Structure formats: structure tokens, C-alpha cells
Amino acid sequence: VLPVKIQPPLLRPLAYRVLSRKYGLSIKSDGLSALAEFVGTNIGANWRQGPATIKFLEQFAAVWKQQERGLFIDQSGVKEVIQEMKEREKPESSKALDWRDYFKVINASQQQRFSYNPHKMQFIFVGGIAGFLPDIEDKVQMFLTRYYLTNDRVMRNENFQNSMSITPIKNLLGRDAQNFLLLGLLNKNFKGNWSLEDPSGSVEIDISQTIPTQGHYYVPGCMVLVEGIYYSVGNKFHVTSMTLPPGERREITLETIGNLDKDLKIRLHLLEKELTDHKFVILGANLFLDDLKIMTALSKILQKLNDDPPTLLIWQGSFTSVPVFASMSSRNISSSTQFKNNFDALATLLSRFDNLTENTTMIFIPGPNDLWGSMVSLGASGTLPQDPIPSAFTKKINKVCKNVVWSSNPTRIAYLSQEIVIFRDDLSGRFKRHRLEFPFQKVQETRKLVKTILDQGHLSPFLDSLRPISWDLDHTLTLCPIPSTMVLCDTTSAQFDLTYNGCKVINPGSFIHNRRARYMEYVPSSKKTIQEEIYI
Amino acid sequence: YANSTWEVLQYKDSGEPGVLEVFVTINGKVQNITFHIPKTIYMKFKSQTMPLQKIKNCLIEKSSASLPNTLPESVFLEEKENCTSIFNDENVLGVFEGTITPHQRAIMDLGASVTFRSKAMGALGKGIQQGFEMKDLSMAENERYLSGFSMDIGYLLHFPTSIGYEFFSLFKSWGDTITINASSLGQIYKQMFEKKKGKIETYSYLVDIKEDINFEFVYFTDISKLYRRLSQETTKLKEERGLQFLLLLQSPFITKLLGTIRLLNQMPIVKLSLQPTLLKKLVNHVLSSGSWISHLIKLSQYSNIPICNLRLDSMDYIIDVLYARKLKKENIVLWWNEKAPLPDHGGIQNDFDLNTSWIMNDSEFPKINNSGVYDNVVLDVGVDNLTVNTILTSALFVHDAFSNDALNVLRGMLKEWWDEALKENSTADLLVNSLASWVQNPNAKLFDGLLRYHVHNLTKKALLQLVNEFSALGSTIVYADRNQILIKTNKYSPENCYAYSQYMMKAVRTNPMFSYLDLNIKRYWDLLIWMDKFNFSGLACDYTAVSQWQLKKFLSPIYQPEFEDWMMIILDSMLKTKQSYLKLNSSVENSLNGFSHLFSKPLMKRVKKLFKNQQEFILDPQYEADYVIPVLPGSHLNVKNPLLELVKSLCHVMLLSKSTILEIRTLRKELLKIFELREFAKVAEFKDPSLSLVVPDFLCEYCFFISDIDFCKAAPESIFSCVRCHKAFNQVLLQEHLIQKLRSDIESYLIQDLRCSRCHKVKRDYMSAHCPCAGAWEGTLPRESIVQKLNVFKQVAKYYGFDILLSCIADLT
Ligand SMILES: [Zn+2]
Ligand SMILES: [Zn+2]
Q1: Chain B residues within an 8 Å CB radius of A326
Q2: How far is the CA of A202 from the centre of ligand 2 (A)?
Q3: Domain extents for chain A?
Q4: Which terminus of chain B, N or C, has fewer Cβ atoms within 10 Å?
Q5: Contact B750 A325 (CB under 8 A)
């Protein structure tokens, strides 16, 4: 533990002798200097560092897998990894593992681009002021990628469970009366009649005399599994039974993707048991800060949480009563600055609690009436991958706390080996409005909604003419791994908590249902939820 | 309550949908009354008879017409159940399509402000205990004299500021105790306040002010005097005149009221919502408070509205209330949607629709602009009342069109207000101008995107018809932008202009379509070199001359005076040539055919001298302060030879004329020979140095002027202030509108329709590698266009110092 400074020239012989000869690692001058600094700091007289170098190189070859170790990033990374493995074994550090280094929240703009090579591959894709503008090919392939994902899901589930094959729509032309099973995107033709769209083509469908699976919502833009007899007399597909694709368990998708290292899995599993007492509190929807009654109720809720602050306090969308837009007036209407005043008022009612706002990440989720998204939509369901609340309106709130995250509407949480997805949207209303009728209670409707969302595998299985989506930011809506926990926030659906296909779906509902400021509590360790209604 | 108007209809809900305060001005004095109002819903039973009959009988089909995109279901407490009777069985709560109008609103819409309880004394006493339900009470009554005669006031104006001076001032009709060296300035304003009160005592005849105005200089250090002292003073005044005073409240933010003051003054309340130098503001406001009381009385007399109407663009609320009344007289469902700017189209208004989105974010007004030199006399005709005249004369399958019946209702109402204002009618004209301005106001309580789009198309087509009419009259158009139109009269002689112009205006007014369209000629141009609105010069009335060339701002500071001087030289040469042609006599070929010969040789020699001077001093320091290209919001061009840019601009403004193209091309070739540049070289071609960034249909909050503000081209003084007036514009409003346009551009790029790159057939399917004609898909809005627009926005924000716009740009990436 004796500190010492050792110059790179004397350490150079032994360093190379092991890094280069034993394993084949090239060490640069700057990297050699950094390694000499590390060895001098964490050991004296620089004699018994052979095991340290061996551990460094073996970790580097096991994880990083490249050359030129002296990049100031590879060396630091391997030293840190050595630190955590020594910590979990319980030197430079001998403390306990902290979940903060394994807890992260992923925005819609910072995920990994995963485009599926149509045959069999899930590839990885990963520049100026207008560097966020999607390209045209992104719009072209937006639905193709979704179809390929659904087709892979069907090829894994249906054939191994039910064994009719899937015939591409282009294969129905010459056939006169044979039976086919089509997987296509239900949509309305420009001529005004329903049809299914496939990468190979499209075909009109005669929806009369169809028996649909009643446990699903059927809407244009959702991908269905129709079955019927093609007719070449009028080029129509007389569908008999149409149902949504079967869902998949998350664990099944993980071995196909094959994404985790063993040490990271062990550490995450260990802190899963160690961190038993962590509480996630999910507030209600439509926190209308403009309303004085809701403002007073929020004070009582924050006071109650101040006694025992939770791990995360998630705030739902539509923070203001009226949609924000450019207002022509000489008063303090000023829909921009009035938002700033509302957040400043929130800061007053939030900085008053010293016990709260400390050791509590505060994630904020935007809604239909938030800045930069309500400017054009005027409070309607506009572009789905909503950008976070602008930082220009969060000066006081961010100054008051120390860990506050402003995230996208379809945000992702990486608290542990499990993934949590938060989504604020009135899915039930749109589903009911755009559900198509077949010419041929509340808990049942909630189950229908959850089943439709999970079977579709997409957060919004809707057409581009009903819910515009940023073309490149579409993977942020795809439920390819089917995350374990999903906060399907809503304002037109009754509060519920359901589990399906290994996924826990929780809907806190509106903040004020009749007279109570409802909010939800989530315990990741026990996977148990409970609502906390508080009277006004 | 007998023929008594409620002064304020404040929402005394107490959780009851229908219970609210009614301060009806009874014959003796105002008294607090409670009402009861069922929540009417316009859910017409479309092809489905539902016999459920939960609480109230439901009318079948409502005998009305819905909104393409007399009280059915008259419940009383929807709180009973939010889920209500959701069935989705052929329009039985399948689509709401009802009314969101809460209490305090349906009362004004249906019941007149003045009302009389058409019941006996026993029924009156029975209704005293619980309230006066509108179902069996409160018939609408005539409003010949709706207001009162002598009403006490409780003036409590307050103008806070962050500098550190508190304006928690209160005024009394007789107490005169204004509690805040002010006596001298107060008397100074009193010196003409004798005349002001004489006007009040001859036109208002409502209240009088005591002459002993005592000013109490008290410093409201903290809340103890900021709020508690004000509350105790106002409760002392309240117990002084018991429910016998009208609160004239002025406060930028109303939360001070609703804290404790509002329920301290439940009596009739009005929300005006409007260091030594700032002292005069208080005395001016207190001594002018006696002027608009008569205006409010007149407004409430004409418009059937109580005194609870807010003064923030009160014309918008008046128009909403009157339009709702005229629409309720007809069997048309309303689209109120008080909570949100979007129309109350049931529930279909909350989801994205491509057509609705397009009609919303499309306000670009076509401009007809012809560039050239016009030796003929051209008139700067300025149109006015285009929207009003358009809706009035619009009388003279389509899913994108507004309802024809609602438009007819609007036309009839506008005709009524118009004829009224024509005869002496103050409020009538106020409301016509206000309607012109509201149609496009999302804050309106009846705003409809379809209606605004319909009005926009009607205005576009009316302007096109006006242009065609002027062309037929024998005058070509060189500019038309919905606020002004420039016509090229064929009369060469400037003397023969007045009679021709008057004949033209009369002939335009003869057409029924433009009868209400008022036109006035602003300026006469004997000569005009027109490139754009912001790049023009010429002789104006024949003796004044103007040189407004935005191209000059993009030249190096040394050459800006050279361009300015040579513009005057060119204009004078053109004038001399025109005079010579007119003297000799008294487009293929006009009066100008050799105007370049006057200054060709001096210009060439000056350019040679300037080129030698530049070659001497281009690289040497201490001169780079002159040979520097200015940075402007529209700057997008890299300049290597600033003198070449100067000669390019001069040659372009000379090439504007169509007749003298050849003699100016020869001059340009000779000029370019100096730089050893070819005549048709790419670098020698003139490209506009400035881009454009227009905020369409920007509205001036004072004079109601609808103009397209351009930020990359207009001078800074012409964007922060209006045109017809000279009042300033809010920085926050400009930044908000710029952000709105930026988000509209982003959304329009994201929701664009792809089309084939070879046959241009629009893409119809969702999964398709390419067009069936073997052509790759391409967008109708290229990505490069949006990138350029974003760069323009960033340049404007960085130059003008728009902080919120910079925050938006940063938040994009
Ligand atoms: Zn103005
Ligand atoms: Zn094509």
C-alpha cells in the first residue's frame, strides 16, 4: 500500500515480456505510462505485479478482444472490472457493489439500432445539427422490419405449436380455391376495402362470414394471421378465421439474441437478492399542475412519501391542464413561460421536503400536452417517440434535486437483469375507436388490451396515418424482448395490474379518478404491486 | 331576480354540476342566488333507439345535423359514472359528439343575461331555499337596458414588477384612499383630468371620483403587508359596502385573487388583466379607469353577456358567445371544447389525422411577384377587410370542407354586424375586426381547423379574383400579398394618374364580390426598380426617392456606400432617359433603351480603380476591417471577391429590366473582363445572398394586422414591431411562433408521402422495396430541404439571440 512513482522505461521490459509474448498485446508509450502509474500507486517497489498484469490481460482478452491496450480507455475499463470482481469476491477497492453502476435509464434516442437481416440475423447498426433526421429508406423499411420480427415470432411459435405454413401473398395468384394461411398487415385499400399487406404483395379480403378470436383487439395496422380460400374470379381472399400472432416468452427471445458476461450475470443475480427492499412508486396520469386541487393533493402525497422515500418516483405526462401552443396575447398567458412558472411552483412544493428528493431518482415522462410535442399536435396524439421535456423548463426542478432524469414517453429502465418499459398513452380509447366490426367486463377489456399489445409485439400497432412515428426511432416501440415489467399508463382505462406471458403490465390510471389521488407502488424484488388511494 | 341580470356567474360549483353563484341585479339591490343546470349532451340517436333511460329521457336523432370530419340525454350529474352507457352499438356513446360546455357557459349560451322568474311568490319562495333550476325557471328576457345606472366600484388595480417597487394599490369611489412626492404629479395629471372627468360626467354618467386624493406611501416588505394587509383592507371595504360594490380588479396573474381575495370579493368582479416615470402609470390608470366602464356597459348592452366577461381580447369571447347562440337557434351541434384548443368533435379530434394535420399546418399565402423596371406609373394599393369582405361575399362529398350551414350562419351574423356598424354601431365594428382576428385563434371557444382552412382558401381565391379583375381593367400586377397590391397602370404620364386611379377603384367596387373590400392608394411610383418586397427603389410621390435594398447588407462595409451611391446614379440615369423619351415622343422596347450609356464609362473606370485598390489592400492588414463579409441571418454564400459581389449585385439590378437586357449584358461582360472572368461563368452568376424564413399570418395584438413576418430578410425594426402601427412585439411570442414553425416542418417531413423517382406515382402500400415501374421511392420533401431550414433557424437564433429557439435546436440533437 506504499505509494511510489515508477517511470515507464524501467517497467517497459517486464511489461512487454508478458503482454506481448504471453498473449500478443501491443503496448503504446502513453498506455505504458498509465500502467506504470497504476502499478506505482497500488504497489510499491514494482516487483510483485505479475499477477496484476496477468489478470489485466486475461480480462482484456476475455471481454475487449483487440490490440493496442494502451488507449487510456481499455486499461481503465479492465482496471475497473478487476475492481468490481475483487469487490464481489469480498488492492485499490474492497467495498460493496453499488446498484447505481448497474442501474440506468435508456432514452428513445440512445438505444441500439437492431435491424433484422431477413433470412436469419439480428444485426447491429449503432453528425451535425440535423443529424437526427431519419432517411427515406428508414420510412421504407419501418414496416418491413416489424413484419420480419412478427414473422420470426410466428415461425418460432405457431409451427411448433399449431403445422400449417405461411404462404406469402404473392403466391396466391394462380391458385384457384386452395386454402392458405397468411400473415399480413391489416389495412384499408385506397379503394376503401380491407386488405392485407405483405412484403411479397397485397390481397383484398372478404371479411364477411369471419370468426375472429374474441380475446384480441383488431385494428387497421395490426398484423394478423388470416386463414381462408383464395378466389381468382375477383382476386379476393375469403377469410374464415383471423387471429393475432401468438406471443413469446422473454427468456425464449434472450437465447436467440444471446445478449447478457457470466460475471455481470452473477453480480446482477446477487444484488437481486441483496436489494430486496427497493420500492418504485408510479404516480397517476395527468398531473395537471395548473389545477390547485391537484397541487394540494400532490403536497399530501409528497409529504407521505417523504417519511420513506422510494427508489424511483416516476411522474406521468400532461403536466399542464391545457395544451401548449403559440398564443397571441399581451398577458402572462405566454404558454411557454406559464409552463416555466408551473415548474417553478412545483419546485417550491418539492424543495420543501429535505428527506425526499434525496437518494431518489425522479424520472419524468411527457404526455400529450407537453412542450415541444404539443406545439403542432395541439394536445392530440402526434409523433409517438416523444422527446423529453426541454431542459430550458427544468432549471429549478433539476437544481432542487440531484438525480432527476427527463426521458422519452416510451422509455426503458435497466434496473437489473429485468427491463422495465414506461409508456404514457391512451391506448384503450384509440383501440375502441378504430376497432373494426365483424359482420360474422372491464377486466376483460384490460386483458384484451394487454393481449393485443403483447401479441402484436409493438407498443403502438397502428398505421402511420394514425400515429406518426420517427422512422429511425421505431425499435424503441418494438417489444422484441418482451420486457418483464411494463408501465402501460393510460387515462381512459380502469386501473389494473395483469401478468401475461411472463410480463407484468401495470396501469396507474388517471391521477384523480373521482376524488382520490391514486398512485401505484412497485416492488421489483417481490414482483408485487399495490395501489395507494389518498382522499383529497 | 325579476328582469335582473347576473353581474358575475362565478363557478360556485361546490361539486354540484349546476349550482353556481347568480348575483342578479334585483330592483332593490344585487343579491346572491343559486341556480341548477342540467348537463345537456347532443348525442343524437343515429339509427339506434336505446330504451335504457338511465335518468333523463333521450331525444331520438336529436333532429339535428352533426359535424363532418332540444336537449337529448339531459342528465344532471355525469359524475354518476364516467363509463356512462358505453355500448358502441351504432352511435350510442360510440362517438361522443356531444358538448363539453360546463356550467357558467350553457347559461350564457342559452339563457339571456337578463332573466325574470316567471313564477308566483310561492314558487319564488320555494326556489329560494335550493335554487332556480333553468328547466322550470329563468326564461330569457329583453335586454333594452341590461346594465344599471349607479354602481359602486372597488377599484383594486395592481401592477407588480421584479425591480422592487410594489403597486398593491386600492381605490374607493368615495373613500379615495389610494394606499400604495406623488401629489405633485397626481395634480399634474389632474390638470387635464378635469376634462377627462367632464367627458366621464357627460358620457359615462356612472361614478364620480373624490377630489382629495391622498397617497399613502407604505412599503409592502413581506407577505404580512403584501397579502395579509390587502386582505384585511378588502374585507374592511366588503363589510363597509355589503355586497354593494363591483370589484374593478387588475392583476397580471389571478392566483393572488383565488388565494384569498377572490372569495373575499365574491361580489361582482371583473378581471381587467392589463421609478418616477413608472409613478405616472398608476395615476394614468386610476384616472382612466372611469372611461372604460361606459364601454363595458355598452358591450354588455349590445352583446347578451354578463359583466363576468374577461377583458383579454374580449371580442373573441363575445364572438364565441354570439356564434354559439346563433348556432343553437339552428339545429347544429356545438364544438365548444373549452378545456382544449382543438374542436369538440367528440373523441375523434384527439387522434392524428393526415388531412386534419395538413389543413392545420398549412398557412403559406401565395405571392405574385414580378421583378423588373416599371417606367409606367404603378400604384401602391393597400387592400383591407379582405377576410370580412370574403366571408360576406362567399355566398355569391368534399370531406376536407367545412359545414356549409355553419358558414352560412357565420355569413349572416357578419352581415348583421356589418350593416349595424355601417349605421352608427360601435360594438358592431369592434366585433367585425375581432372576428377577422379570431377565426385563426386556437384560444377561441369555438375555433375549428376546418373553418380556418375554409376561410384561408376563400381569401386566397378572392385575392386571385381581385388580381384577375385588375388585369382585365388594363393594369398588370407586380405584387399581391393579401395586405397590399401593386398595379402597373399603363398611363405613362404621371399627371394622368388621379382620374385613372379613381376610375379603377370605383370599377373594382362595382363588382359585388369586392363591395365590402375597401382599397386606398398609399404611394404613386413614377419609376420603380422592383426585385422583391425588401429589394426595391424608385421615385415616389415623382419627387421623393427611396432606396430600400436588402442586398446592400450582404456587401463588405467598404462597398456598401459604393452600392448605395451607384443605385442613386442608376435611378437618376433611368429618370433622365425616361424624360428624354417622353420629350421626344411628345416589354419589347420601353422608354429606357440607352440609360446605361450615361454611366457605362464612369462605372467601368470606377470598377478598374476599385479593383486596383483591392489588389493593393486585399492582403495587407489594417484593411481587413473593410474587406469583410457581414454575417446576417440569411447568409449562405461564401464570398471570395467582395468587389465581384458588388458588381454582380449592380449588374443584377440593372438586368431586372426586360427591355434593356442586351445593353446591360454587354456592360456586364465588359465589367467581368476586368476580373478576367467569363461572361457565363458560374461564379459570376448572381444568387440571392439571403434566404427566407416567414412566420405566416402573424397577428398584431393591438391593431389586428395580419402580416407574414420574415426574419432572414426584413430589417430588425420591421419584425419586432408592427407595420401599420408601431407597437412592439413580445420576444416570447416570436420565439414561440418560430418554434411552432420548426416543429411543423419536422412533423411535415416525418409524415410526408413517398413517391416514385421515375413515374412520380405516390406510394400507396406500406411494404414495398420500390415502385412497380422499377423506380426507387423518394420523398416529396427532401431531407436536404429540412436540413437547410434547420440551419436557417439556427442562424436566426444565434444572430437575434433567441434563447428558447437555441434551446430547441440543442434539444433536437
Ligand atoms: Zn400593429
Ligand atoms: Zn414509378
Answers
A1: 733, 736-737, 739-740
A2: 17
A3: 103-158+245-535, 164-244
A4: C
A5: no
